[PDB]
Design an enzyme around this catalytic site. Structure first.
Site, short mmCIF file in Angstrom:
data_model
loop_
_atom_site.label_atom_id
_atom_site.label_comp_id
_atom_site.label_asym_id
_atom_site.label_seq_id
_atom_site.Cartn_x
_atom_site.Cartn_y
_atom_site.Cartn_z
N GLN A 63 0.83 -1.18 0.00
CA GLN A 63 0.00 0.00 0.00
C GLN A 63 0.88 1.24 0.00
OE1 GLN A 63 -3.91 1.98 2.24
NE2 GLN A 63 -3.25 -0.09 2.85
N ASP A 64 1.21 1.76 1.17
CA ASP A 64 2.03 2.97 1.32
C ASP A 64 3.49 2.63 1.68
OD1 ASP A 64 1.03 5.70 1.32
OD2 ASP A 64 1.84 5.82 3.43
N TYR A 66 6.80 2.89 4.01
CA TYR A 66 7.10 3.26 5.39
C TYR A 66 7.43 4.75 5.47
CZ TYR A 66 7.90 -1.78 6.16
OH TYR A 66 7.79 -3.15 6.31
N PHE A 77 7.54 -3.83 2.10
CA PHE A 77 7.91 -4.62 3.27
C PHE A 77 9.38 -4.50 3.71
CE2 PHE A 77 3.87 -6.80 2.12
CZ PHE A 77 3.18 -6.59 3.29
N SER A 88 5.18 -6.47 10.61
CA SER A 88 4.65 -7.29 9.53
C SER A 88 5.75 -8.14 8.89
CB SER A 88 4.01 -6.45 8.43
OG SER A 88 2.96 -5.65 8.94
N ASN A 123 4.78 -1.36 -3.87
CA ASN A 123 3.79 -0.57 -3.14
C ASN A 123 2.88 0.10 -4.18
OD1 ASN A 123 4.38 -0.88 -0.40
ND2 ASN A 123 6.16 0.52 -0.61
N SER A 166 -7.00 -6.55 2.40
CA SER A 166 -8.05 -6.12 1.44
C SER A 166 -7.59 -5.12 0.39
CB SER A 166 -9.26 -5.54 2.18
OG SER A 166 -8.82 -4.47 2.98
N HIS A 187 -3.49 -9.75 5.95
CA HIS A 187 -2.23 -9.03 6.02
C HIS A 187 -1.39 -9.57 7.16
CE1 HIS A 187 0.51 -5.59 6.47
NE2 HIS A 187 0.18 -5.31 5.23
N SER A 189 0.43 -8.03 9.32
CA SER A 189 0.52 -7.18 10.52
C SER A 189 -0.07 -7.92 11.74
CB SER A 189 -0.21 -5.87 10.27
OG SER A 189 -0.13 -5.04 11.42
N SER A 192 -3.89 -8.78 12.20
CA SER A 192 -4.60 -9.65 11.27
C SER A 192 -3.86 -10.96 11.03
CB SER A 192 -4.86 -8.96 9.92
OG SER A 192 -3.66 -8.33 9.47
N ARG A 195 -5.54 -14.19 11.56
CA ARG A 195 -6.76 -14.35 10.79
C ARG A 195 -6.50 -14.83 9.37
NH1 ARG A 195 -10.75 -9.61 13.08
NH2 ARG A 195 -10.76 -10.38 15.27
#
Length: 223
Positions: A63-64, A66, A77, A88, A123, A166, A187, A189, A192, A195
């Site tokens: 996503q973004d 760091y 990552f 993560s 990213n 997501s 993810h 992290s 999550s 899960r």
């Protein structure tokens, strides 16, 4: 376009003259004029420097970048020595420890050794103002990284996309699953990871799927 690998430039430079990209570059430049923006300019496109575009075999979407000092270096990552692996990434290494039996935590967070083997660590948003999470979202990067994903989708064969969380899943929602393979879970992290991420075995599964198109496996230990 400095610090942008030639094989990638050949296929993606059609983006550079589009109104959204010109607007984006202008915005990032105005940000750099007044602030520190990560990663540094020479590392915005590290993901184009580590391997040829046609040698990409595996795509991990983030996503973004760091937003802490010295953390972002152009690969999702990953952090360059001596920066400690963020949470993560420690969880990614935990899953590797059980999935790729014999994998030992390398004692750093630099994933360049995967990038060189054709693991694209992309990213969706490629810059961020220092310390300000998500600060460069929705300024044009998403459209650009969509172009990258769409080029690979339409031109390469038998890639494995790893979509964790997501946001990444949405970004990969139109991948052709007859042409490529898509593996999806939570993810990594801490909030999550229990899960679905632990036990996903995406690293071993990736290599089994790469074999279906005659591709040699990623050596996940080569870090």
């Amino acid at each position: 376009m400095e610090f942008f690998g030639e094989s990638w430039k050949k296929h993606l430079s059609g983006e550079f003259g589009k109104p959204y990209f010109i607007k984006l570059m202008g915005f990032v430049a105005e940000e750099r004029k007044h602030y520190t923006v990560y990663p540094p300019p020479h590392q915005v496109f590290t993901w184009t420097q580590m391997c040829d575009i046609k040698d990409v075999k595996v795509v991990i979407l983030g996503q973004d970048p760091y937003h802490g000092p010295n953390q972002a270096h152009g690969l999702c990552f990953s952090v360059q020595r001596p920066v400690p692996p963020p949470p993560s990434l420690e969880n990614i290494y935990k899953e590797l420890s059980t999935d790729i039996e014999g994998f030992v935590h390398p004692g750093h967070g630099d994933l360049s050794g995967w990038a060189k083997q054709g693991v694209l660590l992309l990213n969706a948003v490629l810059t961020v103002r220092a310390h300000q999470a998500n600060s460069h979202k929705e300024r044009g990067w998403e459209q650009f990284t969509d172009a990258v994903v769409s080029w690979l989708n339409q031109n390469s064969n038998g890639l494995v996309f790893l979509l964790w969380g997501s946001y990444a899943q949405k970004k990969g929602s139109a991948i052709d699953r007859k042409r490529h393979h898509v593996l999806q879970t939570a993810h990594p992290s801490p909030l999550s990871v229990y899960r679905g991420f632990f036990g996903c075995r995406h690293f071993s599964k990736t290599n089994e799927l790469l074999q279906k198109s005659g591709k040699k496996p990623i050596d996940w230990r080569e870090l």
